[PDB]
Amino acid sequence: DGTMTQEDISDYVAANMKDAISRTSGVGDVQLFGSQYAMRIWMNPNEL
C-alpha cells in the first residue's frame, strides 16, 4: 500500500520480528537484510 519505505520495513523486521525468529526452534544465526532505526544526529560543522 506504499506507506512504508525500505528503512521503515527494515526497522519493523529488526524491532518486532527478528528476535522471536532468532529464538525459534532449530534456527541458528539470523542475518537482517537492512538496519534497525537509531536516533540519528546528523551534525553540521558550519553551525557547530
Q: Which CB, 16 or 46, lies closer to a second copy?
A: 16
Query: Rounded to whole angstroms, how far apart are CA atoms 30 and 23?
Result: 10
Residue 19 touches a second copy, criterion: CB under 8 A: yes
13: nearest Cα among 29, 34, 44: 34
Is residue 28 a contact residue for a second copy (CB under 8 A)?
A: yes
- At closest approach, how far in Å is the CB of 17 from a second copy? 11
CB-based contact 27:6 (threshold 8 Å): no
Task: Please report, as ranges, the residues that interact with a second copy according to CB under 8 A.
Answer: 16, 19-20, 22-23, 25, 28-30
